[PDB]
Amino acid sequence: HTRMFSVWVNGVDQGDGQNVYIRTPPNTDPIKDLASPALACNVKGGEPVPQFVSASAGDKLTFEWYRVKRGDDIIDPSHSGPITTWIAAFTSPTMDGTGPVWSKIHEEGYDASTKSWAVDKLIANKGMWDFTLPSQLKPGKYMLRQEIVAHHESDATFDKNPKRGAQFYPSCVQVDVKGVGGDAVPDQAFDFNKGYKYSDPGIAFDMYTDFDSYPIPGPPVWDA
Ligand SMILES: OC[C@H]1O[C@@H](O[C@H]2[C@H](O)[C@@H](O)[C@H](O[C@H]3[C@H](O)[C@@H](O)[C@H](O[C@H]4[C@H](O)[C@@H](O)[C@H](O)O[C@@H]4CO)O[C@@H]3CO)O[C@@H]2CO)[C@H](O)[C@@H](O)[C@@H]1O
Ligand SMILES: [Cu+2]
């Protein structure tokens, strides 16, 4: 249970973005049903918010998370797992991020050297999660999506035991990208409802074993 407070551009807080440039869900509840339309942008994914984060291709974005109040414990430490960041064209205001539209731009899973998950690092860094917009990105409006997946109950799948299963915490953010000479259009065209499956070893995952690797769902980070 966690959601976003605000976005920072090159270390500058843009200010409370909830229902401003973030499509904020009404609460911190997870999505579990891989068939749910809310898997992409959460329960209010389809409702436009009025503002777009102003950023340039190449900029460092920080997404700030919290649990109950800004600056708190961010997420219960039981909720180990990966954090992935995606981008899609902003097709129209009432897009909900369903369909074959996404490209992965950043990921962290499990680091065997430090036995540390992305979620451990999120907590240690007070809910600040950093990534770069590709400098080649063609200028225009995009939806950015950042997802925390918690695996504390992933040792069963939702289709078999609906009380358990992977927990997805997606957050979609509206961004208006200034170009720096790039022409690249993200083209993985990944579709969460089709591409995430209960058979996926990174979804049907037992975090309570000796493993030293975690397979992050979806394609590798988009290139060129
Ligand atoms: O399954 C084998 C494995 O189990 C390990 O124990 C797990 C439990 O399996 C799992 O159910 C449990 O889930 C907790 C979770 O850790 C909490 O963070 C969460 O807290 C919620 C709360 O339920 C909500 O009411 C509230 O609104 O939000 C908070 C989060 O902010 O509650 C769930 C339900 O129990 O996690 C356990 C690990 O901590 C064993 O440890 C292991 O030995 C077994 O092999
Ligand atoms: Cu939770």
Swiss-Prot record:
Q: Name one GO molecular function term.
A: metal ion binding
Q: In practice, how is this protein used?
A: Lignocellulose is the most abundant polymeric composite on Earth and is a recalcitrant but promising renewable substrate for industrial biotechnology applications. Together with cellobiose dehydrogenases (CDHs) an enzymatic system capable of oxidative cellulose cleavage is formed, which increases the efficiency of cellulases and put LPMOs at focus of biofuel research.
Please write the reaction equations for the catalytic activity of this protein.
Answer: [(1->4)-beta-D-glucosyl]n+m + reduced acceptor + O2 = 4-dehydro-beta-D-glucosyl-[(1->4)-beta-D-glucosyl]n-1 + [(1->4)-beta-D-glucosyl]m + acceptor + H2O
Disulphide bridges: 41-172
**What Gene Ontology biological process does one annotation of this record name?**
cellulose catabolic process
Q: What does this protein do?
A: Lytic polysaccharide monooxygenase (LPMO) that depolymerizes crystalline and amorphous polysaccharides via the oxidation of scissile alpha- or beta-(1-4)-glycosidic bonds, yielding C4 oxidation products. Catalysis by LPMOs requires the reduction of the active-site copper from Cu(II) to Cu(I) by a reducing agent and H(2)O(2) or O(2) as a cosubstrate. Cleaves a range of polysaccharides, including cellulose, xyloglucan, mixed-linkage glucan and glucomannan.
- Which class of enzymes does this protein belong to? oxidoreductase
Question: Which residues take part in binding O2?
Answer: 152
Family recorded in the similarity comment = Belongs to the polysaccharide monooxygenase AA9 family.
Q: Which positions does UniProt annotate for Cu(2+) binding?
A: 1, 79, 169
Keywords, A to Z, come to: Carbohydrate metabolism, Cellulose degradation, Copper, Disulfide bond, Metal-binding, Monooxygenase, Oxidoreductase, Polysaccharide degradation, Secreted, Signal
Cofactor binding remark: Binds 1 copper ion per subunit.
GO cellular component labels:
extracellular region
Q: Does the keyword Disulfide bond apply?
A: yes
Asked if Oxidoreductase is a keyword of the record, the answer is yes
Which E.C. number(s) belong to this protein? 1.14.99.56
Q: Which domain of life is it from?
A: Eukaryota
The full protein's residues present here are 23 to 246 of 274
Q: What is this protein called?
A: AA9 family lytic polysaccharide monooxygenase A
Q: Which cofactor does it need?
A: Cu(2+)
**Which subcellular locations apply to this protein?**
Secreted
Q: Which residues bind (1,4-beta-D-glucosyl)n?
A: 45, 76, 78, 155
